[PDB]
Design a protein around this motif. Structure first.
Motif: not given
Ligand SMILES: Nc1ncnc2c1ncn2[C@@H]1O[C@H](COP(=O)(O)OP(=O)(O)OP(=O)(O)O)[C@@H](O)[C@H]1O
Ligand SMILES: Nc1ncnc2c1ncn2[C@@H]1O[C@H](COP(=O)(O)OP(=O)(O)OP(=O)(O)O)[C@@H](O)[C@H]1O
Lengths: 87, 220, 353, 286
Positions: A34-37, A58-60, B24-28, B82
């Motif tokens: 998971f990429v996330v801020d 939810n928002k990761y 956000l760029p939520y996942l890879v 998501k």
């Protein structure tokens, strides 16, 4: 009442690298990366490569860092406490 | 001629609609670039690239949108939101955790002057590391190839590890600490994949340096 | 000007969720199809009206809808790692024949590997089959990799490089299908060539029965043999394996078939030392009046890079002398010293047959 | 271009519910709105639409206005929720078309290359599958008229969709479905003669009227052409079946044979098993 917050911390996830300040790539034991801020509650400078941090499923987004990365078992025979056999 | 500033406002206003999609760029999602046209059965043409997900599921989405196909050959690490399955930007660099950077070392507290009587055999050492940096311009003229590997061996204590790292202090060379047995883990295919990552940084990064120990045991 | 709004309309197409891929098995009726996702669950679902007859297939990868799980359009495959195996390059032709030895071994893989593409009619008319495998071991000298490596890209721009690091994979390693995947995309290149290097690790021997890691080694070997045992392109593809010593092959790989040709390396000869010399000259140059025979004769039984190191080591003594060239007296010094230091490290050159 | 259209009961209701909108306030004309089509292929489909205030003066028979501020921004509404849905044309409830309808389509051709108009019916009466569809083309004419723009009939058919039959098909609840195989096919036969031969009499009386008055239509020639395709068999006195006579009963050959063979053994299944189970309970009880 306090169970609703931090309920989403599942699961413990390790990060990988950083191209920029806001966004980091993170990998979780679900095998899904998971990429996330990170949330505004945690400073970006406290995130170091290889740090297990909390998450909001939810928002990761990053929630709270968890210091231990380790280790399954192997501690109980390693750890020794209490005294005996004085000088 | 002034209509360019009029449309410039609506593209920035709609770029703000991209902002809420960029947080956000939520996942890879592992990327695989593909170009195919499907005759129907009027005509529908377009470029569509098959995408992965690290969750072990695989999906199918049109070519991004935003960053175009100019970058890159099929990748990973890109952010996607998501279940909407749209990738906003192609994010570097590689992976993972301690595999990317084995050890971060600034510079040692000691210098090469700390060895007495070894001045004869330190010159051979100091040369091979220093010569490819400052003297590289003289090598293209004479056709000289700099040495790469160096075998430093002696009965302990020989002061080998102190002398090695100390030579990287005066040369500004970035040091990376690595050991041979550190490449063995329970899970097979770890230390082997590390060199794929390690030498990829050797192509990306400029020396600097990499030092290892106990090559004889691991070479059995 | 308006191309930006076109990309904005493309974002409206980005709002569509991606569907889920799956592998079909067979069909019970026209209204009931059995599909199996890559995750492993199977679904008997209906189909929509926009598809065609090419969707049915005998178990070809398809994509399933996110609700009805119906098949929209089938994607052939996807591969991340393939591009890293696409970039392997080696020269020669000439640079392969310039290695100086062994002379007949250059005459071996020339007609064995490169020739089938340019003149396949020569083998089929006479009726002799080209070899489907080869094995190059060492190091009595050098050239175990280079001999097969230079002819690898000399066949055509076609090559596929395999590193032993990809076989081990991880815990419960799924590379069993990646060995199938890597060879699947190896058949995307025609005519295909297969390399295996440093098999003394992933070639684990079952003589003394060890941990199950030796078993999964054999399973990865099963993925190698299966696709190469086809039922598919066989005589056209050329597989290559390499090892330090061929005691790790087990009676299966020790046998021909899988590993066919076994070739070792010998030392050069006199007046042939002047031949291999000319190709080792290359970038490094020296004084006008010289005789290279003193240089190479003092180092016998050395790697081509070791002699290449002797030329650079003698050239790195020039910067200490602040001259471009050096007299051959100081040469032989740096040549003899370093060479005799390598011979003490030459132990364990004995290899089993 | 546009061959056939698919009209859902949902979008057709969007014309019908607007008949309650402006029907209570009146006054003249009809319900008119702009049609949102879904075009996946040459076959046309319609899912939703939006009704727009519209009026057509009598006097002044050529006066018509759409509200295009209603058409523009509301498009960006339905476009934002549904990216696939776009305007393929317009519609109205008719029942017939005044000559002014030529100008409604040509104005909105900036929105769509060809705008298909759909004439609908708020009160079902006759003769069959309701409403109507037209396409805008130019055939000029054979007589040499200046280029003639006349809407050609497009065959309309109702169609279904997932999840839309929930409330729609629920409220009726009074229908018997079907039953296929017994009553379903035979009621059609009684109607196939009714609806088949009534248009036979309605047209043959108007075709006789041709010679009398209303000429043109000459037509020409489509009238007698396909009528002569109907003439492969007339069938007139008497039936000209001399070749199809033995074949007539020969098609009934096996149909009667099986009906004789099935009813024999079906009886053996019905008669025997009934007598068995009956006397087992009947006489053993008393
Ligand atoms: N020949 C020498 N020159 C300089 N210092 C030395 C020498 N021999 C021993 N030492 C000193 O002895 C100490 C012990 O270092 P030692 O030589 O054991 O490391 P090492 O054996 O090279 O490490 P490794 O086993 O990881 O290579 C060092 O701090 C070093 O300063
Ligand atoms: N005959 C030769 N001519 C030119 N260069 C050579 C020759 N032999 C070896 N080299 C150089 O040595 C390097 C290694 O070559 P090669 O693969 O033959 O040896 P190796 O397989 O690494 O050694 P080993 O068999 O001990 O593993 C190559 O980069 C090549 O440039």
């Amino acid at each position: 009442q306090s169970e609703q917050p931090l309920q989403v911390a599942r699961c413990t996830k390790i990060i990988n690298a950083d191209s920029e300040d806001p966004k980091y790539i993170i990998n979780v034991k679900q095998f899904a990366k998971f990429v996330v801020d990170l949330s505004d509650q945690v400073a970006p400078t406290d995130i170091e490569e290889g740090m297990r941090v909390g998450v909001d499923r939810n928002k990761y987004q990053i929630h709270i860092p968890l210091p231990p990365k380790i280790d399954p078992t192997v501690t109980m025979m390693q750890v020794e406490e209490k005294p005996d056999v004085t000088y | 001629t002034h209509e360019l500033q009029a449309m410039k406002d609506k593209i920035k206003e709609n770029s703000e609609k991209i902002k809420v999609n960029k947080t956000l760029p939520y996942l890879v999602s592992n990327v695989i670039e593909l170009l195919d046209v499907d005759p129907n059965d009027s005509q529908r043409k377009g470029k569509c690239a098959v995408i992965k997900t690290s969750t072990r599921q695989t999906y199918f989405l049109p070519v991004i949108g935003l960053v175009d196909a100019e970058k890159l050959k099929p990748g990973d690490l890109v952010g996607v939101n998501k279940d909407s399955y749209l990738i906003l930007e192609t994010l570097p660099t590689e992976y993972d955790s301690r595999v990317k950077a084995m050890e971060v070392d600034e510079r040692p507290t000691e210098q090469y002057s700390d060895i007495g009587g070894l001045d004869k055999q330190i010159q051979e050492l100091v040369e091979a590391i220093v010569l490819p940096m400052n003297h590289k311009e003289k090598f293209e003229n004479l056709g000289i190839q700099p040495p790469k590997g160096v075998l430093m061996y002696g009965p302990p204590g020989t002061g080998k590890t102190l002398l090695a790292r100390a030579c990287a202090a005066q040369t500004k060379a970035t040091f990376l600490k690595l050991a041979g047995p550190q490449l063995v883990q329970m899970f097979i295919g770890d230390g082997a994949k590390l060199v794929r990552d390690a030498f990829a940084l050797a192509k990306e990064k400029a020396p600097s340096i990499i030092f290892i120990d106990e090559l004889d045991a691991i070479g059995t | 000007t308006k191309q930006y709004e076109k990309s904005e309309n493309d974002l409206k197409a980005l709002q569509s969720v991606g569907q889920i891929v799956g592998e079909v098995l067979k069909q019970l009726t026209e209204e009931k199809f059995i599909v199996k996702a890559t995750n492993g669950p199977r679904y008997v679902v209906g189909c929509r009206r926009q598809l065609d007859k090419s969707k049915l297939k005998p178990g070809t990868r398809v994509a399933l809808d996110m609700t009805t799980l119906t098949i929209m359009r089938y994607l052939p495959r996807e591969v991340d790692p393939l591009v890293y195996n696409m970039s392997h390059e080696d020269p020669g032709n000439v640079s392969y024949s310039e290695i100086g030895g062994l002379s007949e071994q250059i005459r071996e893989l020339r007609e064995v590997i490169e020739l089938p593409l340019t003149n396949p009619e020569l083998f089929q008319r006479v009726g002799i089959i080209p070899p489907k495998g080869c094995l190059l071991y060492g190091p009595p000298g050098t050239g175990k990799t280079l001999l097969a490596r230079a002819v690898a890209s000399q066949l055509d721009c076609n090559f596929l490089k395999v590193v032993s690091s990809s076989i081990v994979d991880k815990y419960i390693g799924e590379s069993a299908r990646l060995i199938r995947e890597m060879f699947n995309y190896a058949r995307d290149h025609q005519p295909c060539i297969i390399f295996m290097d440093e098999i003394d690790a992933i070639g684990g021997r079952r003589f003394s029965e060890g941990t199950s890691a030796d078993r999964e080694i054999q399973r990865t070997l099963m993925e190698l043999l299966n696709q190469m045992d086809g039922f598919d392109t066989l005589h056209r593809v050329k597989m290559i394996m390499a090892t330090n010593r061929p005691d790790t092959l087990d009676p299966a790989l020790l046998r021909p078939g899988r590993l066919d040709r076994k070739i070792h390396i010998d030392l050069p000869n006199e007046q042939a030392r002047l031949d291999i010399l000319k190709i080792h000259a290359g970038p490094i140059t020296k004084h006008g009046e010289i005789d290279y025979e003193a240089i190479v004769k003092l180092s016998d039984g050395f790697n081509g890079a070791d002699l290449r190191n002797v030329c650079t080591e003698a050239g790195m003594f020039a910067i200490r002398a602040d001259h471009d060239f050096v007299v051959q007296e100081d040469f032989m010094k740096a040549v003899r010293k370093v060479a005799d230091s390598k011979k003490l490290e030459s132990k364990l050159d004995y290899k089993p047959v | 271009a546009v061959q056939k259209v698919v009209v859902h009961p949902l979008v057709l209701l969007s014309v019908v519910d607007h008949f309650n909108r402006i029907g209570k306030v009146g006054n003249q004309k009809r319900v008119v709105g702009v049609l949102l089509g879904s075009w996946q292929k040459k076959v046309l489909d319609v899912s939703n639409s939006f009704a727009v205030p519209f009026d057509e003066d009598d006097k002044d028979d050529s006066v018509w206005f759409l509200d295009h501020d209603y058409l523009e921004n509301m498009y960006g509404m339905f476009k934002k929720v549904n990216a696939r849905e776009r305007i393929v044309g317009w519609y109205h409830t008719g029942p017939k078309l005044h000559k002014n309808d030529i100008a409604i389509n040509e104005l909105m051709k900036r929105y769509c290359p060809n705008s298909v108009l759909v004439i609908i019916d708020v009160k079902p009466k006759d003769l069959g599958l309701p409403t109507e569809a037209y396409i805008s083309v130019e055939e000029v004419h054979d007589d040499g008229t200046p280029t003639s723009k006349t809407f050609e009939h497009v065959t309309s058919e109702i169609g279904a969709e997932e999840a839309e039959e929930v409330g729609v098909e629920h409220l009726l609840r009074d229908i018997k479905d079907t039953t296929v195989g017994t009553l379903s096919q035979r009621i059609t036969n009684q109607v196939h003669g009714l609806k088949g031969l009534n248009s036979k009499l309605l047209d043959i009386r108007s075709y006789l009227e041709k010679v009398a008055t209303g000429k043109l239509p000459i037509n020409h020639q489509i009238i007698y052409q396909l009528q002569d395709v109907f003439n492969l068999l007339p069938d007139v006195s008497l039936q000209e079946f001399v070749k199809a006579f033995y074949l007539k009963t020969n098609d009934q050959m096996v149909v009667v044979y099986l009906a004789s063979l099935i009813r024999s053994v079906v009886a053996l299944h019905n008669l025997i098993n009934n007598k068995i189970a009956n006397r087992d309970a009947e006489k053993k009880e008393g």
